[PDB]
Design an enzyme around this catalytic site. Structure first.
Site: not given
Length: 212
Positions: A138, A180
């Site tokens: 991530s 993200e």
């Protein structure tokens, strides 16, 4: 072509939405990404334990891994780009030659400022090394977006055309606003350098990801 580097939330969103557009996500794609953002540990921990061998996972987790792998593969980066990952110091607890006492002394800052010799040691111990994450990775296009500050910034150059999912849309993430970018499981990065920030209050590890 140039590498992109975002500091403006509006421009990162514009760029990121172009990846989403290209992926043509299905309802299942959306569900997989959202559920990952909610609760990654039931996937992350087994994948790490299995050293990436999907055939060692539970049936529910295997299905989830095939799904997320497929979802991420639906978009590639349209430009070389940097993404960021803000980390706690325990990220360094498995760096060979960087001892527990090194870490202990590292977190003994001078008014928030890190010891230059210890950061120099880190550079000496991490440069030119490849690190691999067997889970998913991530990252974010804008460093610290929607997140509190952390001691370490992992600054990752992604090659143009590598698999990557931009997921900052409200139906895709339980944590909107982080800008993200989700990278494939088994991401590898080769560290170029370890330096102190502006401030000396942040440790920046700059690395290059291998195209996937």
């Amino acid at each position: 072509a140039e590498t992109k580097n975002f500091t403006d939330l509006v421009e990162a969103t514009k760029w990121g939405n172009s990846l989403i557009k290209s992926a043509k996500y299905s309802s299942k794609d959306k569900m997989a990404i959202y559920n990952y953002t909610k609760n990654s540990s039931p996937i992350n921990t087994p994948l790490r334990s299995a050293n990436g061998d999907v055939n060692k996972l539970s049936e529910n987790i295997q299905e989830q891994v095939r799904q997320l792998d497929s979802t991420i593969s639906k978009s590639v980066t349209p430009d070389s780009v940097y993404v960021y990952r803000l980390l706690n110091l325990d990220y360094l607890s498995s760096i060979t030659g960087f001892t527990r006492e090194d870490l202990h002394m590292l977190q003994q800052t001078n008014n928030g400022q890190y010891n230059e010799a210890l950061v120099s040691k880190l550079n000496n111990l991490m440069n030119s090394r490849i690190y691999r994450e067997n889970g998913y990775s991530s990252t974010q296009l804008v460093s610290g977006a929607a997140l509190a500050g952390r001691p370490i910034e992992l600054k990752l150059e992604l090659p143009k055309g590598t698999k990557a999912a931009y997921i900052d849309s409200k139906e895709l993430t339980a944590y909107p606003g982080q800008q993200e970018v989700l990278l494939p499981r088994g991401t590898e990065y080769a560290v170029g350098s370890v330096k102190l920030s502006d401030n000396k209050r942040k440790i920046i590890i700059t690395a290059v990801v291998f195209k996937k």
